[PDB]
Amino acid sequence: EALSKEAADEAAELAFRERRREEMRRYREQLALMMEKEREETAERDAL
Amino acid sequence: MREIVHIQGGQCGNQIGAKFWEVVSDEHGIDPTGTYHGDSDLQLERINVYFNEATGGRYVPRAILMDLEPGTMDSVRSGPYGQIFRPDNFVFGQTGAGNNWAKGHYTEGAELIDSVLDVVRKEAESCDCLQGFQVCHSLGGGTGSGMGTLLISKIREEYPDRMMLTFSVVPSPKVSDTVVEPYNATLSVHQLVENADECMVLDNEALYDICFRTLKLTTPTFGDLNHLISAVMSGITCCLRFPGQLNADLRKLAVNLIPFPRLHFFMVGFTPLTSRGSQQYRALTVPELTQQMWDAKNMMCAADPRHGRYLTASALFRGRMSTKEVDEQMLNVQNKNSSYFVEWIPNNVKSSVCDIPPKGLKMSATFIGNSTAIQEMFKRVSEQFTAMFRRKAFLHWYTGEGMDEMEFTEAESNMNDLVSEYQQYQ
Amino acid sequence: MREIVHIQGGQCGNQIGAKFWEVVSDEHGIDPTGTYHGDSDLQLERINVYFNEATGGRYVPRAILMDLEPGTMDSVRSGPYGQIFRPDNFVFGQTGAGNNWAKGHYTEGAELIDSVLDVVRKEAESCDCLQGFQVCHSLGGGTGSGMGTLLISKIREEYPDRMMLTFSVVPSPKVSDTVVEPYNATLSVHQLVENADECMVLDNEALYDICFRTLKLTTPTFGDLNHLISAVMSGITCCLRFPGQLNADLRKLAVNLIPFPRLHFFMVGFTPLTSRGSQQYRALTVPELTQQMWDAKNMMCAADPRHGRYLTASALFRGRMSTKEVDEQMLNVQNKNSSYFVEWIPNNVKSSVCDIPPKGLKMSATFIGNSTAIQEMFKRVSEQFTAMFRRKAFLHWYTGEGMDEMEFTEAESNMNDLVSEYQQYQ
Amino acid sequence: REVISIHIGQAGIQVGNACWELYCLEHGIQPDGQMPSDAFNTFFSETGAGKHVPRCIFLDLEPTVVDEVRTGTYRQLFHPEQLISGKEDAANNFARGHYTIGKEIVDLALDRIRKLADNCTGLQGFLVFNAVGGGTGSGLGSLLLERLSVDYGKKSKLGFTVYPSPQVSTAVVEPYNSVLSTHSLLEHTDVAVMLDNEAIYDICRRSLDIERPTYTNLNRLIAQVISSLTASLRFDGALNVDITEFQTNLVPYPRIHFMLSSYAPIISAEKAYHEQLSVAEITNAAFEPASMMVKCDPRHGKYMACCLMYRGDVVPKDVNASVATIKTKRTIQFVDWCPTGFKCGINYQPPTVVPGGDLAKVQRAVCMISNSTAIGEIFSRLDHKFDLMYAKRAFVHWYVGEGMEEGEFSEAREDLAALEKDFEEVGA
Amino acid sequence: REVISIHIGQAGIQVGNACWELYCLEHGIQPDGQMPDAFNTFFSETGAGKHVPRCIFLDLEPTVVDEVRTGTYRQLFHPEQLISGKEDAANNFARGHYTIGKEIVDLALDRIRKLADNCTGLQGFLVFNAVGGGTGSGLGSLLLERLSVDYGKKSKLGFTVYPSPQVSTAVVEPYNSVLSTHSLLEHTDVAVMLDNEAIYDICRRSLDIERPTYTNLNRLIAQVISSLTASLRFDGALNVDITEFQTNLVPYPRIHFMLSSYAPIISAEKAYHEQLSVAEITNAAFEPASMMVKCDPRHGKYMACCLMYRGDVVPKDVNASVATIKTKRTIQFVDWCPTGFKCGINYQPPTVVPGGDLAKVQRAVCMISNSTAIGEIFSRLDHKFDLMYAKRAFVHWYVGEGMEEGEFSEAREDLAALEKDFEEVGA
Amino acid sequence: ASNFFAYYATEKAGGKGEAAKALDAARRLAQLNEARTMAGGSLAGAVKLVREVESARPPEPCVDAAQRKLYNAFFQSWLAGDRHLPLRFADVTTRKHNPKQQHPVYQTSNSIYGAKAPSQLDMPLSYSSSSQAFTRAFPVTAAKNSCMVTSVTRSNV
Numbered sequence A: 001e002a003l004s005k006e007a008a009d010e011a012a013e014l015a016f017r018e019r020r021r022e023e024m025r026r027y028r029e030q031l032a033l034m035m036e037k038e039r040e041e042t043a044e045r046d047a048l
Numbered sequence B, C: 001m002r003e004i005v006h007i008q009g010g011q012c013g014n015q016i017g018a019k020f021w022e023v024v025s026d027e028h029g030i031d032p033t034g035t036y037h038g039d040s041d042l043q044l045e046r047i048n049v050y051f052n053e054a055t056g057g058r059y060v061p062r063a064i065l066m067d068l069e070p071g072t073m074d075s076v077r078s079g080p081y082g083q084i085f086r087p088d089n090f091v092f093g094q095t096g097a098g099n100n101w102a103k104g105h106y107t108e109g110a111e112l113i114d115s116v117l118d119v120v121r122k123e124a125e126s127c128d129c130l131q132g133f134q135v136c137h138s139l140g141g142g143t144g145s146g147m148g149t150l151l152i153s154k155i156r157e158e159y160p161d162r163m164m165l166t167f168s169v170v171p172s173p174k175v176s177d178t179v180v181e182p183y184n185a186t187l188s189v190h191q192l193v194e195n196a197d198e199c200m201v202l203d204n205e206a207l208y209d210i211c212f213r214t215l216k217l218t219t220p221t222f223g224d225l226n227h228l229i230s231a232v233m234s235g236i237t238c239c240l241r242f243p244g245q246l247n248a249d250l251r252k253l254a255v256n257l258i259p260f261p262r263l264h265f266f267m268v269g270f271t272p273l274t275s276r277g278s279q280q281y282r283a284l285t286v287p288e289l290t291q292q293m294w295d296a297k298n299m300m301c302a303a304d305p306r307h308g309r310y311l312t313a314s315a316l317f318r319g320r321m322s323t324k325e326v327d328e329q330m331l332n333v334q335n336k337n338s339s340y341f342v343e344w345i346p347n348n349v350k351s352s353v354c355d356i357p358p359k360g361l362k363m364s365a366t367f368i369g370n371s372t373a374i375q376e377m378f379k380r381v382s383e384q385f386t387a388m389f390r391r392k393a394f395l396h397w398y399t400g401e402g403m404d405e406m407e408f409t410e411a412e413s414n415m416n417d418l419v420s421e422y423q424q425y426q
Numbered sequence D: 001r002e003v004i005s006i007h008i009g010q011a012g013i014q015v016g017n018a019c020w021e022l023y024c025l026e027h028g029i030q031p032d033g034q035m036p037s038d039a040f041n042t043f044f045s046e047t048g049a050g051k052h053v054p055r056c057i058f059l060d061l062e063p064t065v066v067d068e069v070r071t072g073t074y075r076q077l078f079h080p081e082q083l084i085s086g087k088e089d090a091a092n093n094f095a096r097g098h099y100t101i102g103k104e105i106v107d108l109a110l111d112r113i114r115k116l117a118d119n120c121t122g123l124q125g126f127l128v129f130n131a132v133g134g135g136t137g138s139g140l141g142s143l144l145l146e147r148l149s150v151d152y153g154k155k156s157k158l159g160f161t162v163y164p165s166p167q168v169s170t171a172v173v174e175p176y177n178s179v180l181s182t183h184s185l186l187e188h189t190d191v192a193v194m195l196d197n198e199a200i201y202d203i204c205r206r207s208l209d210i211e212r213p214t215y216t217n218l219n220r221l222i223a224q225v226i227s228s229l230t231a232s233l234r235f236d237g238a239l240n241v242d243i244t245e246f247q248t249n250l251v252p253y254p255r256i257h258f259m260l261s262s263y264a265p266i267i268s269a270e271k272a273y274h275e276q277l278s279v280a281e282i283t284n285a286a287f288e289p290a291s292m293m294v295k296c297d298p299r300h301g302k303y304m305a306c307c308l309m310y311r312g313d314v315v316p317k318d319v320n321a322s323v324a325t326i327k328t329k330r331t332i333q334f335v336d337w338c339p340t341g342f343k344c345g346i347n348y349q350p351p352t353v354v355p356g357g358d359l360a361k362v363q364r365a366v367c368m369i370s371n372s373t374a375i376g377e378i379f380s381r382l383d384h385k386f387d388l389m390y391a392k393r394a395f396v397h398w399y400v401g402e403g404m405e406e407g408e409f410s411e412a413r414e415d416l417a418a419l420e421k422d423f424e425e426v427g428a
Numbered sequence E: 001r002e003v004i005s006i007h008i009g010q011a012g013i014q015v016g017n018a019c020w021e022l023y024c025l026e027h028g029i030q031p032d033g034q035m036p037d038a039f040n041t042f043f044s045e046t047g048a049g050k051h052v053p054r055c056i057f058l059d060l061e062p063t064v065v066d067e068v069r070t071g072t073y074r075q076l077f078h079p080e081q082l083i084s085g086k087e088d089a090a091n092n093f094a095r096g097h098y099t100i101g102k103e104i105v106d107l108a109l110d111r112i113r114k115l116a117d118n119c120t121g122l123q124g125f126l127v128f129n130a131v132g133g134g135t136g137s138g139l140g141s142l143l144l145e146r147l148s149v150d151y152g153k154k155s156k157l158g159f160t161v162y163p164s165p166q167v168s169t170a171v172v173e174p175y176n177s178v179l180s181t182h183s184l185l186e187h188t189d190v191a192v193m194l195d196n197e198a199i200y201d202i203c204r205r206s207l208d209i210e211r212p213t214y215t216n217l218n219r220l221i222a223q224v225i226s227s228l229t230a231s232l233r234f235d236g237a238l239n240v241d242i243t244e245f246q247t248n249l250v251p252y253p254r255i256h257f258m259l260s261s262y263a264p265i266i267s268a269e270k271a272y273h274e275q276l277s278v279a280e281i282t283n284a285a286f287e288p289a290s291m292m293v294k295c296d297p298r299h300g301k302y303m304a305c306c307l308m309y310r311g312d313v314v315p316k317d318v319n320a321s322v323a324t325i326k327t328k329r330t331i332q333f334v335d336w337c338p339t340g341f342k343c344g345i346n347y348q349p350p351t352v353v354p355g356g357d358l359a360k361v362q363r364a365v366c367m368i369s370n371s372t373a374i375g376e377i378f379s380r381l382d383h384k385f386d387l388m389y390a391k392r393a394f395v396h397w398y399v400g401e402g403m404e405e406g407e408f409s410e411a412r413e414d415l416a417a418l419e420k421d422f423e424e425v426g427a
Numbered sequence F: 001a002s003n004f005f006a007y008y009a010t011e012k013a014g015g016k017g018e019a020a021k022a023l024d025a026a027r028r029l030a031q032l033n034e035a036r037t038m039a040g041g042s043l044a045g046a047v048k049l050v051r052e053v054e055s056a057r058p059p060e061p062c063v064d065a066a067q068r069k070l071y072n073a074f075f076q077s078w079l080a081g082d083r084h085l086p087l088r089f090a091d092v093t094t095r096k097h098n099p100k101q102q103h104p105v106y107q108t109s110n111s112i113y114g115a116k117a118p119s120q121l122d123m124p125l126s127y128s129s130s131s132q133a134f135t136r137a138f139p140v141t142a143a144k145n146s147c148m149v150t151s152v153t154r155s156n157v
């Protein structure tokens, strides 16, 4: 019983590691789009 | 037959008691929904000590929760086994003391302590024969120390022939959460020495050390420390709830541990506490339990027993064992380390055995020791109290509310004479 | 009934002990998972000397590993049979002394020695009656030598009535790794003459010579040398682990081989040790085992026995053998080379026989002879020590840590009086 | 448990605009103010069904910024009666904004917050935002806190003021306003948290690495600090503290209430990818002068007490170890009286990220609030340059024409001198 | 086991560029910063799937720093590690030690404090600098002295590049060398010199590179450093950490000057013809043709020696080879220490790098010893330094910087005292 | 099937856990104990009978080996035991941005605060709110003691 509980424990820990890695990979993408939008707004500014 | 109520004060007390109730409910085989689902019949005869028959297998804990911030109640109820407590026992204020002994002893006490007194009275005369009371609270906080202490005083002046257990966590420089820790601790210990019959001294630093070395835990959240303390309370009262070859209730332990009325502060330890990896290489025998028991680092307090002497000691046992092995092991541990034991008291150890071990372990043990080494922590607290009290730092928040200085003088003098007599008996 | 604990220090000591545990487990039929898979029941009655019952037929070696670099631990765990050790005995520092006897005897030892004594007391109190302690290390390194030296001193001041075996690999100018070899060796041998009950001298130059000539290997890795040493240490304690027609425990050999309390250094030889090609052309008889024993090239030290006089000698025999052949062979080898044996002690050999040969060999033998030929290596190292100390080379690292010159003077004076008494008895 | 927040002056309502925007994005409330198809109860009182109004008032004298906020994105969010607006600006005049215009504008704010508190049931306290450099945030703000103190008194009032920087200054008569404001702030506000401007400029230039930062980022960071110190009230944690803890745990004397605030980790979007986040390095990051929200030097001073507000995924064992290691180090030194000068607290939810901002999302952050004697040097530095101009009776004619005299100036100067003496004696 | 590297000077940054690319290549870490426990001594596991080197490049001229910032390893290094100044010291020790150093050294120290805070089992530090230049000389001494002030007992390895006697790129470099040695005497723990003209001879003879640039020089320097640190990085049959060089190769508190060697430096074509064993490479590591310092060990006496072995190496034949070397009379040792050697064996062979000029060799040897050739090198430098100082040439720049003539005389006398120390040790 | 596929995915990646080999060793020791009970206290007879029991089973047709024993071990473990946010935070499209658009030439500084579209990854991962429903259901904090004592005497006899 003790060994089975321990094994389930590291299984859950590995699952948490995997989901956190996926989230960290997800969080990156937003910056570039905002960058291009800001350049477009500045271009509109200078044209006007 | 014998009855023990449970009182939890403050956030620390509420969480520790919630874990304790989870552990005892699991031990008696009752599911979080509140219905019995166990297998052994032995679990049924000794649940009136902690539960009550409501409606066809519905059991409600004999506990009273008191606090001032709804966050604690929400945390208690949100988690599992939170729907077993009766809402009527949720005596509860609204303002908040906030790490202020004066507030929690004079301002919010006068309007909330009467209500919890009525609740605990209704819960007390509901049962047949009171064995004692069990209170869990902190000593650094405001709503846990002051209100809990005043509740202790009122109950003692109400029921003087009924015993009292109070598990109190104490502050340390290594684990120091609030800034007014000595100011609260000195008054709390000054009031507890005459009111409480005995207490179990606890602290976070020793628990952190235990879960680092023995448990080898990576992220030891508060849950693990509360689990250890709940196992401690389950072990200390296991004799009432299960038969054994040598029964010993709370009164027997108290009379066998307290030689003088002011010598009622104990340090507690639990065993076995093995790491997740070394559990397979370990052996299960009485000498192993005894050796892991008397270890200095296994104690749940920041007081090395090797710096003093043991006045009286007690060990509570659970599992199918042999009494002769226990007796000879205690005789051997007394004979080997003869210097650490007091001289004018033969047989400084009281032993007891219970036939029902906790599930998941074949053999368990609980150690309660009354050594004089605890005086160093009292000196450590009193020197901080004097250092902060010399120039009246943080003082007027107490005095400006109704508190006064000569009570601080009384508390420091009481601490000084207590540590002086501890040194005397060393 | 009689138990032996194992202590290993440093990289070389840890690897030697790992090979020793592997070969002993193979001899007793214990798989790398700690379970029994042997064939004869005789392998079970004498495993308490090195193993402990953990949980239903699980065996853990009675060993304590201690060192100062994590690479050692990683190497121990990487190889087979590395998962049978209990992790609690993996006592381990963090910084490393680094070929500095002063560091490993004053700085790192000061805070790590309490834990190693704690764990060795834990291991010693587990059994009933200790037979002796076994320590494996070297005299060239700084970490192993100093820490093992101070640990031996602590054990001697703690347990002075128990036997002690220490295996030390002493450097030679031919095979010389570090520059500070004489400084470590002199202090280690200075402390060993008053603490260790007896010492077993080993040397890598002789191991290289024997694996070049007798074994004829082209790439003699450290594994082969550690295997040879492991076979030797298996042979010396075989009597306790197996019944024989003439029993001889560690204490019996120590008392019959040590004539004076300062004369406790021995050279080692083991038979049979032959090339695989030459194993087919060789027979298995006691005169041939004897001639392979007494060959001066078979000794595992840089000390030619023919350059001195044999004070005492001992032969450990394994396998169902003839006693008359054994003692007649010893009588003949004493009568022929009467010059090499001491005059004022007749019958300079103690003989014993065991009925259980090592696995794979029908007959084996071990030699432990105490002669005065070992004093030449003591002068060999003390002349280097004096040459280095004449102009104080490599001294400020030792001196700057706290130890001073009078320790060096005391160590060299002990070495000179030791060699003078060796010459006196020659 | 609920707390209402009032904003006084030009800077106060800008900080509030940042704060409420952060709150709305944190609780998932749309800018209009309704739930898209429970912790908000301490800030938003649910009106009708699916509609929330903040427990705040924005009051000011010049109506330009107030009605700009009125016509902004959050028209439906703020209640129209809450956004109090005057008729004429005080024009950087403490006397004008404290006695001329304050008389007819404080009563409306008073009987507005009276019914706002009547709506409340578990009022923990108040928190005010104002700038001492100006006149509106100084004069009528000080009057309003005085009347609040004579109205409730026992209830906490948190003062997050903005002092002028020593070398960086936008106004000229601002030392007079700061001195006159402090003359009542000393004995009226219960707990005050100090914030300079040049310190935040250095923080965003060095750490956040914006070379052209404006007030928007400053207000965003101030809102982040307030959210970090209030998330314990809003959200549950392993060890939560309320607004009352700062009354006792951080104040050593009834007249010494000026906290040094700091926040960590102040990190850009790309830097978070490179470095590793853990409790030890962010705890250390909360103590260097390079991460202080007030331009001063803690090295010359001694810490009386410290507070640690933690958000995110932090266990108590490692923060306790970090505190122990900080105590062991001798680079910083505590006062001789208090050995345990720490006050820690943990909350589960990590700080949220504002869209369009430069602050990257962080798993765990620290909000540090301490008390030192460097403020004793700050007040002396301010008073020296206050005496510099006052010695020649410069700009005094405006104030005396408003109706005042030399008496209040002299009494405020000697009050600051007495406060300096208290700081130097408490330092010993 | 953690150790960090700091690089001071124009040469130091290029050396670090070679060393770190070698480290990432051998550990299989892509230039982006993630792999597709051994790396723990050089890289920190940040977040998830990201490794940052434990290094800082600090200099005054930003050209090389921005070149690194715009190179292939843009995302490999944390951006604010790369400390860069605004104006060069311009080969002026006084300027780099008192003018610019006082404003730039504090930031680097505040960074390395946090870098060590991140570390937990810090073995020590190691510095890379060329004493000929100004930035590598001036602020390097201040950084080292305040390092000794802050830590002291932690090992500080000084890998310097001394100017060649007849080969030179600067003019006032004797002054910088003297003033740098004045502090390097009592500041660093173990110092290793590597001259440039000796490397030129090695590559001309062994690697037959008729037109070599600094890239090959730094590549082989990185190979030497990797061979030195492989024992810390990977376990072997006989491991040896950095602390040993303190206690095993320094005979006197003021005599810490190591001559380095590496073997075998063999081209790809020559590798297919010459059979690799231990005896020939051990012999090859002792002739002056395989030295990175232009000195003659025959004129000197070896006090001690250290040997690094990587690849397929067993102890038996290395012991036989060292015994044969000891029996040989072509090299003489000091009369004090008879066992003047130190061996070390590691399993992992040195790796090859695309674009490099070394072949896949089964084994390699790195030799570090100590002789009195340092005594003649220092004397040769001191004669030309005195030739410079006799007419007070270029002294006016240092004087106008804020310095005087007292420290020049005291440094010259310190060099004379060192020469006396070498000549009395040689007795 | 799901457990088998997860198991096989792990073994291919060399993901066997420390607890896994401990379980395997424990099962082996249990088999040895059962064999001891079968053949008496002598462990030699136990390991023998284990070996003849293993060798007695007749082999079955197979195409390969590794997958065969892998499936056998997995099924043995299977017999032993089993081993293998509010709507507003989950989705952002539910909320309406409906910002106040401003003339491109004339842009005030205060308009930046409330004009930016949130994204899915801008939302928090977990929203650990506190439900005050139970505390709200409680009456006013002004409690009172109004009762008549009717406790029966239960002396300990």
Ligand SMILES: Nc1nc2c(ncn2[C@@H]2O[C@H](COP(=O)(O)OP(=O)(O)OP(=O)(O)O)[C@@H](O)[C@H]2O)c(=O)[nH]1
Pocket: D008, D009, D010, D011, D014, D062, D089, D090, D091, D092, D093, D131, D132, D133, D134, D135, D136, D137, D138, D162, D164, D169, D170, D171, D197, D215, D218, D219
């Ligand atoms: N942090 C911060 N401070 C500001 C901001 N705007 C103004 N201040 C500070 O406010 C001080 C002057 O007061 P103002 O904000 O201009 O307006 P006021 O306080 O209401 O005083 P009046 O101009 O008389 O109305 C300046 O010294 C600034 O430091 C802001 O957007 N953010």
Ligand SMILES: Nc1nc2c(ncn2[C@@H]2O[C@H](COP(=O)(O)OP(=O)(O)OP(=O)(O)O)[C@@H](O)[C@H]2O)c(=O)[nH]1
Pocket: E008, E009, E010, E011, E012, E014, E015, E061, E088, E089, E090, E091, E092, E130, E132, E133, E134, E135, E136, E137, E161, E163, E168, E169, E170, E195, E196, E214, E217, E218
């Ligand atoms: N071995 C080697 N030496 C170099 C290299 N680059 C420069 N040097 C040496 O360094 C000396 C001058 O110092 P530099 O490295 O060029 O630059 P610096 O040390 O920062 O000093 P300044 O140029 O004055 O700022 C020259 O005399 C060279 O001998 C290199 O890539 N390899």
Ligand SMILES: Nc1nc2c(ncn2[C@@H]2O[C@H](COP(=O)(O)OP(=O)(O)O)[C@@H](O)[C@H]2O)c(=O)[nH]1
Pocket: B009, B010, B011, B012, B015, B016, B098, B099, B138, B139, B140, B141, B142, B143, B144, B145, B169, B171, B175, B176, B177, B178, B204, B222, B223, B225, B226, D238, D239
């Ligand atoms: N074991 C344990 N101790 C706790 C927990 N929460 C708080 N504490 C301790 O309780 C002390 C603070 O008490 P506090 O909650 O302020 O008491 P209160 O104000 O009366 O409610 C700290 O020193 C903590 O060490 C917990 O969950 N488990």
Ligand SMILES: Nc1nc2c(ncn2[C@@H]2O[C@H](COP(=O)(O)OP(=O)(O)O)[C@@H](O)[C@H]2O)c(=O)[nH]1
Pocket: C009, C010, C011, C012, C013, C015, C016, C099, C138, C140, C141, C142, C143, C144, C145, C169, C171, C176, C177, C204, C222, C223, C225, C226, C229, E237, E238
């Ligand atoms: N038999 C044997 N001897 C070894 C081995 N490794 C090193 N040695 C010897 O140990 C000496 C080196 O000791 P050292 O490693 O410095 O000791 P430590 O650092 O305390 O472990 C050398 O002279 C070797 O001859 C090994 O694997 N087997």
Ligand SMILES: [Mg+2]
Pocket: D009, D010, D011, D134, D136
């Ligand atoms: Mg304004």
Ligand SMILES: [Mg+2]
Pocket: E009, E010, E011, E061, E133, E134, E135
């Ligand atoms: Mg340069």
